[PDB]
Amino acid sequence: PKEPEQLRKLFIGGLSFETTDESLRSHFEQWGTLTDCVVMRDPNTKRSRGFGFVTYATVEEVDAAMNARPHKVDGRVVEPKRAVSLTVKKIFVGGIKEDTEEHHLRDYFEQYGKIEVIEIMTDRGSGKKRGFAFVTFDDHDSVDKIVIQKYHTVNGHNCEVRKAL
């Protein structure tokens, strides 16, 4: 009953060209068991392409690694990102109807990351709630964690959530 491997993988950009499979692993093994750890290299020169990826045994380990940012690896600050299924900090939240308030969205989404803006949409002409909102976080990993979830339940409502611009 292991989580799908794609959800346990981190792309690591901005590597020092000195970083190896071995030094990448020794760094990121501090936050979990690594089943995979690869630095991308030119197939002819063997010179690093400056990025790679690691795969943890569990999603909780990915979370731990992401929560331990910033990561300085072989003297350079790198850029870890979760693997695809587009880096933004804002989400569209739809299906919240007219009874959902800012505290409902806050209490739920603050457990994904630090919120900077909550905007509940209202009709330009009437002021009535239109049934959707935008939430802006201080960091993209919150959004990445949010949009891979199959379901979101806020204030009893089943919500549609998607990345916003």
94 and 78 inside one domain: no
Say which experimental method was used.
X-ray
Locus of tokens 């569990």:
58
Structure tokens given for 34: 């690594």
12 and 77 inside one domain: yes
77 and 131 inside one domain: no
- The total number of structural domains in the chain stands at 2
Q: How many CB atoms neighbour CB 30 within 10 A? A: 10
Domain C-terminal end among 82, 112, 138: 82
Q: Give the whole-angstrom CA distance, residue 165 versus residue 162.
A: 10
- Could you tell me the CATH number of the domain that includes residue 36? 3.30.70.330
* Helix runs in 68-101, H state only: none
User: What is the three-class DSSP state of 142?
Assistant: helix
The rounded Cα 4 to chain-centroid distance in angstroms is 16
153 and 106 inside one domain: yes
- The closest of 126, 145, 124, 125 to 135, measured between CA atoms, is 145
73 and 11 inside one domain: yes
Resolution of this deposited model, Å = 1.9
Bridge partners (DSSP) of residue 135 are: 91, 118
What's the chain's length in residues? Answer: 165
Domain C-terminal end among 58, 82, 106: 82
| Residue-number span of the structural domain to which 18 is assigned | 5-82
Give pairs for 142-150: CB < 8 Å, separation 24+. Answer: 142/89, 142/109, 142/112, 142/113, 142/114, 143/88, 143/89, 143/90, 143/91, 143/112, 143/113, 144/81, 144/82, 145/63, 145/82, 145/112, 145/113, 146/91, 146/109, 146/112, 147/91, 148/7, 148/82, 148/85
Structure tokens given for 144: 């990445």
Report CA-CA distances (Å) from 124 to 114, 127, 132, 134, 165.
29, 6, 14, 16, 21
Structure tokens given for 12: 């690591």
Q: What is the dihedral of CA 79, 33, 6, 112, to 10 degrees?
A: -60
Q: Give the whole-angstrom CA distance, residue 69 versus residue 162.
A: 24
The rounded Cα 106 to chain-centroid distance in angstroms is 18
99 and 150 inside one domain: yes
Whether 88 and 164 have beta carbons less than 8 Å apart is answered as: yes
